[PDB]
């Protein structure tokens, strides 16, 4: 049978799907370690690799496949479900087998997605340092109308320290934090002014390489929930601007505490999609 990770109901993605809105015809690009298209629960219809001698249709790490499954696991009869199952999934490989990658590679992937009219970008990745080149990339993507979503980071908290990484820290990108199955912020979820919204980031069950599943932890797992919610909202209101979609998700988030640790709160795509 099909299993529904808690993340779907928590952000009320099921409610919106029941309205008949599943992100149909919205192009979402997962800039990660690739995706295992051959996985039954997924359906990658395109992409691009920026990892020497490696196809974007396979995933040697597993991370990308997992993130992707939270974004779009097919609503069939087996496995898991994604926040927006009917989305047009694109694997944009910018990280190698060991979950690492150069900024320029990521910049190349960002541009690709932009040039191929992607609607949403999901970057469950980060670096401690900034980069004029990367900021320009996500800045043009947003300017071009792309909803850019990134994982905030897993540096936890410490006094008033701002532990939000890049590109999440960029104001053109929605920095996503994490909470558990109880809407409680995960201790590892990064904090700071830049934190925008919270999403399920702990114990996220999703697709894993070579037709299986696994349970991972991190803002990596939370980012896709948001990018997926962006897709559902767009499948319902096709012509909203990247900005409007971003604002409605943060604008309808259910409050959870100081914006320093929760941003606007846990996303509620049902409220967002009204």
């Amino acid at each position: 049978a099909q299993t529904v990770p808690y993340g779907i109901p928590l952000i009320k993605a099921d409610k919106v799907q029941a309205q008949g809105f599943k992100g149909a015809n919205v192009k979402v690009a997962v800039l990660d370690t690739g995706i295992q298209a051959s996985h039954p629960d997924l359906n990658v219809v395109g992409g691009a690799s920026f990892v020497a001698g490696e196809a974007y249709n396979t995933d040697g790490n597993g991370h990308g496949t997992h993130v992707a499954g939270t974004v779009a696991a097919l609503d069939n009869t087996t496995g898991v479900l994604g926040v927006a199952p009917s989305v047009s999934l694109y694997a944009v490989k910018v990280l190698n087998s060991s979950g690492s990658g150069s900024y320029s590679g990521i910049v190349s992937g960002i541009e690709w997605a932009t040039t191929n009219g992607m609607d949403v970008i999901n970057m469950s990745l980060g670096g401690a340092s900034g980069s004029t080149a990367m900021k320009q990339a996500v800045d043009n993507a947003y300017a071009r109308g792309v909803v850019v979503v990134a994982a905030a980071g897993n540096s936890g908290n410490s006094g008033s320290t701002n532990t939000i990484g890049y590109p999440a820290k960029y104001d053109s990108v929605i920095a996503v934090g994490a909470v558990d199955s109880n809407s409680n912020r995960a201790s590892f979820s990064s904090v700071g002014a830049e934190l925008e919204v919270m999403a399920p980031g702990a114990g996220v069950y999703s697709t894993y390489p070579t037709n299986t599943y696994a349970t991972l932890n991190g803002t990596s797992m939370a980012s896709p929930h948001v990018a997926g919610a962006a897709a559902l909202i767009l499948s319902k209101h096709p012509n909203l601007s990247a900005s409007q979609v971003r604002n409605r998700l943060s604008s309808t988030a259910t409050y959870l505490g100081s914006s320093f640790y929760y941003g606007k709160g846990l996303i509620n795509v049902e409220a967002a999609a009204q």
């Binding site: 060991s98 690492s100 990658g101 990745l125 994982a151 897993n154 590892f188 991190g218 980012s223």
Partner: protein, 104 residues
């Protein structure tokens, strides 16, 4: 350098970092010392080089060597960790060395 933003499940990390001074001696012995590192006494006189290495561990007496004063050489993932450190998982079995550089 960018890394997958997933939270890792490593056990702990060992980073052979040189330290100590004559008036502020470290506690260690040549056996438990790290290869590539050199240990000196309160007078700056060489005593020995670290005998062990991160990967492949061995047994050492757990006493401080009075003759040595100083040396000269959880969400964190192999990509996220720092080079110059060796990360192990539960039942401390070697896993990898860090890939990132320490912040400046």
């Amino acid at each position: 350098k960018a890394c997958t933003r997933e939270c890792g499940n490593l056990g702990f990390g060992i980073c052979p970092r040189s330290e100590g001074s004559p008036l502020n001696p470290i506690c260690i012995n040549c056996c438990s010392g790290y290869k590539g590192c050199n240990y000196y006494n309160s007078f700056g006189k060489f005593i020995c080089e670290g005998e062990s290495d991160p990967k492949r561990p061995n047994a050492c007496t757990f006493n401080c060597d009075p003759n040595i004063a100083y040396s000269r050489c959880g969400c964190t993932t192999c990509c996220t960790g720092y080079k110059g450190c060796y990360y192990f998982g539960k039942d401390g079995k070697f896993v990898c060395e860090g890939e990132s550089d320490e912040p400046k």
